[PDB]
């Protein structure tokens with residue numbers, strides 16, 4: 303569509319979707335790759351997201367997470383307008399797949415395992431993805447799953463998690479935990495487990511489980527299935543406005559998982575219940591999730607790696623992005 307000069311090395315560009323994603327042919331490694339164009343330097347926020355993702359993806363090394371094979375940009379800061387990230391092609395994603403394909407229990411089980419195996423590495427690095435959803439889970443022709451889109455990712459900060467009632471949030475609404483609309487900034491690992499739970503539910507019926515039309519409607523959806531929170535769960539919500547809103551709602555009963563998904567594996571529904579738990583403190587953790595009987599055919603903690611090393615003006619951020627992408631320049635490559 304517009305300028306996408308990825309150099310002589312990458313040819314045969316086919317469009318896909320702070321820029322554009324395209325497929326290309328790697329004339330060196332002889333494989334078909336995916337390249338993403340990012341033009342973020344005009345804004346501080348866009349630069350912060352870009353630097354953040356580049357830093358995270360370059361440090362991370364995992365089969366279930368998109369790795370950066372190459373980065374294309376100009377030789378100087380002055381000439382650098384766009385940055386191109388390159389990785390192995392994954393022809394599809396869960397969103398596209400769930401629109402037309404019904405998943406067998408075996409596929410749901412394999413997909414969930416890969417999501418959690420990847421999430422285990424992300425969390426061991428003290429990082430939170432914060433925006434897990436079907437469009438972020440890429441798949442190739444052999445069913446390998448990789449997590450991408452670390453733009454809203456942050457370092458975990460449980461001690462600074464609390465905020466007020468109705469505090470605006472950045473991530474995709476349908477996959478937001480209930481505590482986000484109540485008293486959480488999303489700085490805890492339990493935020494990702496909820497999203498994964500929503501994804502599982504979506505894989506079981508090919509439909510989003512909590513499709514809120516706006517901020518508060520999202521909570522209405524969650525409480526519609528989980529029912530009214532227990533007194534114990536309400537006691538953990540010290541924020542008055544949040545607790546009082548919950549208390550003002552008429553009693554809602556829990557909708558049984560086996561009633562919502564009558565053709566699902568019982569063990570899958572047991573794990574779904576543990577991931578979609580209202581109370582973030584009682585919510586299952588990624589390693590407990592992996593150890594659940596539903597994934598026993600795949601569980602092998604010794605083959606579920608953890609991270610070796612855990613984790614400003616637009617001008618200085620542009621400078622940092624330049625310095626962060628310097629290792630891929632033709633200089634040392636030659």
Ligand SMILES: CS(=O)c1ccc(-c2nc(-c3ccc(F)cc3)c(-c3ccncc3)[nH]2)cc1
Nearest residue numbers: 323336337338387388389390391392437438451
């Ligand atoms: C939630 S969303 O709209 C969203 C935006 C971009 C992407 C998305 N970004 C990439 C992509 C490409 C190169 C990179 F190095 C990094 C990411 C891909 C990609 C990677 C591998 N094979 C095919 C496509 N898809 C995925 C989800």
